């Protein structure tokens, strides 16, 4: 009756912080025996819940949101934290209870040819509401028209590459991050153990 | 033409306050990453402050806690309020629109001298 | 906070020849750079961003090179008005960040 956390974390296909990936866990026994107890976890921290109580806590549903960001930007995934990734890309609430985990994927997702497949968000018109998927293909602007008919000025594309390549230092090594949010709204709990 | 014009430069006694203003043309500011730079006479340059297109601002450490950036979106202009000017801050301040990886800082302002009484 | 150091301080080359300016970083900077030419009397002017991409309009006479922690700017044929100060600006942390250099003084004869 074990949850699919295994796959979730080991699928090694993580897409992007741009239009992140989600999963709604339900109908399982949340073991946790491996969670925050596996060996290669680098950083784990939850707000609102203690780890052992967590191992004994029980809930109605779970939301996991995995993505990949640059190591120097992990400090921006935090309650109400302000920056770029946390203001225009993906913003977690202020009273968010749950924990995040981050791995230095300095080998798994990188290529000498440039593992820049993912394009993070660097141009947004207005700050994000918490958990607002804003995957879009538009041209952010300054002049009248967008780049379809203009060039140079007002020809911006919000999806900018990362350029992950091995010479990059630690501060620029792709960290894979996963955030857990436990919802408790009036419903029978299908996740406890 | 696209330009940034500045005002507020002058002289004020130390510890006093001042307010720098920046007007733009042919380009929007509300949706443009703004960055105020300054230059001491004869020395290099240093990033002073930045305001984003959503409002979340940031400041350098040397001036943290003393300067506050704001912008009158209604008439397409930027502003920087200063306080507690000490002996270092005598410098010329520039207004810039910085894009970053997609084109580094380009459009700059004529500048404004800021010296103190003594 | 990567500290950039320019070199040499001064350079005097006969008109019509090449000119070489080095700017040295302390960390890794990959291809995050730019070059500014601040003709004496007004604000600087952007010449070449990223690694070597020539800003719009900027005469082809300029050429940038280098990567990692070391970069170089090269001018094909200096005309009389090329005399100015030049600065290498890094931006490895863009929101919010930049770090300037000490500048270089270039003259003619």
Numbering used by the authors:
A (entry chain B): 334 to 526
B (entry chain C): 1 to 118
C (entry chain A): 1 to 109
Article sentences:
Elite nAbs, mainly derived from the IGHV2–5 and IGHV3-66/53 germlines, showed potent neutralizing activity across Wuhan-Hu-1, Delta, Omicron sublineages BA.1 and BA.2 at picomolar NT50 values. In this study, we used single-cell sequencing technology to isolate hundreds of monoclonal antibodies from convalescent patients of BA.1 breakthrough infection and identified dozens of elite antibodies with NT50 values at the picomolar level. To further analyze the molecular basis for these elite nAbs, we determined the structure of Fab in complex with Omicron BA.4/5 S-trimers by cryo-EM combined with X-ray crystallography. Next, we evaluated the epitopes of these elite antibodies and found that these antibodies mainly fall into two distinct groups, which was consistent with the results of the epitope competition assay.
For clarity, the TH132-spike complex was used for analysis of the interaction interface. TH132 interacts with the BA.4/5 RBD with a BSA of 800 Å2 and binds tightly to BA.4/5 S through extensive hydrophobic interactions. G416, N417, L455, F456, and Y501 of the RBD formed strong hydrophobic interactions with F52, F58, L99, and V102 of the heavy chain and P95 of the light chain. In addition, hydrogen bonds are formed by T28, R31, Y33, A53, G54, and R97 of the heavy chain and S30 and N92 of the light chain. For example, Y52F and S53A on HCDR2 form new hydrophobic interactions and hydrogen bonds with G416 and Y421 on RBD, respectively. R/Y99L on HCDR3 forms hydrophobic interactions with Y489 on RBD. Among them, G92N on LCDR3 forms a stable hydrogen bond with H505, a common mutation on all Omicron sublineages, and enhanced the interaction of antibodies. The results showed that TH132 and TH281 are new generation IGHV3–66/53 antibodies with broad and high efficiency, and epitope and sequence analysis showed that TH281 and TH132 mainly recognize conserved epitopes that are critical for hACE2 binding or RBD folding, including L455, F456, A475, Y489 and G502. Unfortunately, TH027 did not show any binding activity towards BQ.1.1, XBB, and XBB.1.5. In contrast, TH132 consistently exhibited a high level of affinity towards all three variants, with KD values at 10–9M, which is consistent with the pseudovirus neutralization data.
